[PDB]
Design a protein around this nucleic acid. Sequence first.
RNA 1: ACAU
DNA 2: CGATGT
Length: 136
Amino acid sequence: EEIIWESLSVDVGSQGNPGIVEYKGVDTKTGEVLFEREPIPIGTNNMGEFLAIVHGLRYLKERNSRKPIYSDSQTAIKWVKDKKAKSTLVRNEETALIWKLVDEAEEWLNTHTYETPILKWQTDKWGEIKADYGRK
RNA sequence: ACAU
DNA sequence: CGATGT
Ligand SMILES: [K+]
Ligand SMILES: [K+]
Ligand SMILES: [K+]
Ligand SMILES: [Mg+2]
Ligand SMILES: [Mg+2]
């Protein structure tokens, strides 16, 4: 319907899928970059989108902020709601880092509480999410 | 089919 | 064109 401008927007960026994964969070109103994750050598788009939301939850909780989070990823929103990232990515030596970070994010969700609304960014109506990397 |  | 996901 209407954009909630008082919000945090998150997005993944990648080089290949699977490939090098990063993510960032921005103030929806102003575009100010609030956090950026150092690139992870091998991961998937959906793992990165999941980590971005969970990082947003942790960022907002530490700052006592009740703002919602926007994500464009139907998959990642569902994984966060379930507290379980149902990724198909093989677990091997090459993917150990991303899977460690995903496991740690699930662990955080299972030991902490939050009321943050996690909202779908409506790309078909509103254009690209404000945290997008501009690579498509 | 839809969402990345 | 290829991939990740519900
Ligand atoms: K998009
Ligand atoms: K992009
Ligand atoms: K498909
Ligand atoms: Mg996205
Ligand atoms: Mg994007």
